[PDB]
């Protein structure tokens, strides 16, 4: 029930390093969630080592009927209808030439709602290409028009999983956009740059963490389903983001020791934060390899017989996409509140959970406008 929770945030976690192992102090927008899920769907067509590798880098030895808590947390999750805007592109796109066994074709429809589609990739890899790009621009309405740049499939390409998706969501308390100001945005000690910083004080979840010197804002969306947690630290005190020690420190247990309920306090807050727009794009692979999914890619090793009987398959590409655009857009007459400041104008962490599950649908760090 909430083993998979547990499971994805610990992932969640792992790939967000992985990935500041690459890009220490730049932005980051993932999809924890949905690469799990996807994952998670590509996980029932592997068998022998591939499948194995792959369920303990995704932690899913954890998590008993994998598949059917999945199914059940996407329909809880995509359920007509919310305030907010939330559109995947999950697709998995196989070269034409290959039989692939109907019951997974059934399978990741109904567990996932996912499709494995056949194209040429060995003599129409260009058409192919503007063709998945075609279908995933309209799963997302036309946020996303063109996941994969030209050279990114070939002739020479098998397997191919797509993971887009757009987010864009009702605040649950509005900002004014006669507040939302110009203001200086800090990407370090060193450096400053302009962004419009929209301003708000209302009652909000909040929490300090007294060993790290930060803090925690919970701003839920639109209906309550959803809800933002931003990490801000005081200052920047460190010689790049001043996320360094905060990151160092990512658990789960953490980040539930940080986020939990009895360690939030509703307060009255004066909340600055940068109107952003964050689209991100990551070609996986060797990432995940780093995490301990080898065989997968490698076309000897790889054993992908629970999808196609065929001996020469493996994935070629997996590539994913988040983007959100965040803005002042939404729907206490206390004398003893306490009044605190959140003035995210240097980089923070942030993250978009599921408040029912505790699951992490989005996670990433601004740090550079």
């Known amino acids: 029930m909430e083993q998979l929770s547990s499971a994805n945030t610990r992932f969640a976690l792992d790939l967000f390093l992985a990935l500041s192992e690459n890009n220490p102090a730049g932005n980051i927008f993932i999809s924890p969630f949905s690469i799990s899920s996807a994952m998670a769907m590509v996980f029932l067509g592997t068998r022998g080592n591939t499948a194995a590798q792959l369920s303990k880098t995704f932690h899913f030895n954890t998590v008993e009927e994998v598949h059917s808590r999945f199914q059940s947390l996407n329909a809880d999750i995509n359920k007509r209808g919310a305030s907010y805007i939330l559109k995947l592109a999950n697709r998995l796109y196989g070269e034409k030439t290959y039989n692939f066994l109907p019951e997974f074709l059934v ?47 070939d002739n020479m390409t098998k397997l191919v999983l797509v993971n887009a998706i757009y987010f864009k969501g009702n605040w649950k308390d509005k900002f004014m956009k006669e507040a939302t100001t110009n203001a200086p945005f800090r990407l370090n000690k060193k450096d ?22 930060c803090r925690v804002l919970e701003l839920p969306y639109q209906g309550e389903e959803l809800s933002m947690v931003i990490l801000l630290p005081d200052d920047i005190e460190d010689e790049s983001t001043g996320l360094k020690k905060i990151e160092e420190q990512l658990t789960l247990e953490k980040l539930h020791e940080w986020t939990k309920p009895e360690n939030l306090d509703f307060i009255e807050v004066n909340v600055s934060l940068p109107r952003f727009k964050l689209e991100e794009s990551y070609t996986l692979n060797s990432d995940l390899a780093r995490l301990g ?77």
């Not at 058409?127 to 279908?135: C, F, L, M, P, S």
């Not at 400053?192 to 010197?213: H, P, S």
């Not at 965040?326 to 995210?344: I, K, L, R, S």
């Open 293 to 369: 999914v080898q065989d997968l890619f490698n076309s000897s090793k790889a054993d992908l017989s629970g999808m196609s009987g065929a001996r020469d398959i493996f994935i070629s590409k997996i590539v994913h996409k988040s983007f959100v655009e965040v803005n002042e857009e939404g729907t206490t007459f206390c004398m003893d509140d306490p009044e605190e400041n959140f003035t995210a104008d240097h980089p923070f962490l942030f993250f978009i959970r599921h408040n029912s599950s505790g699951s992490i649908l989005f996670l990433g760090r601004f740090s550079s406008p």
């Open 192 to 213: 400053r740059k302009t962004v419009k910083m929209m301003y708000q004080k209302k009652k909000f979840a909040y929490g300090y963490i007294e060993d790290l010197k």
């Open 107 to 153: 399978s990741t429809q109904k567990t996932y709602g996912a499709d494995l589609a056949s194209v040429d990739f060995q003599h129409a890899s260009e058409d192919a290409r503007k063709t998945i790009n075609q279908w995933v621009k309209g799963q997302t309405e036309g946020k996303i028009p063109e996941l994969l740049a030209s050279g990114m499939v």
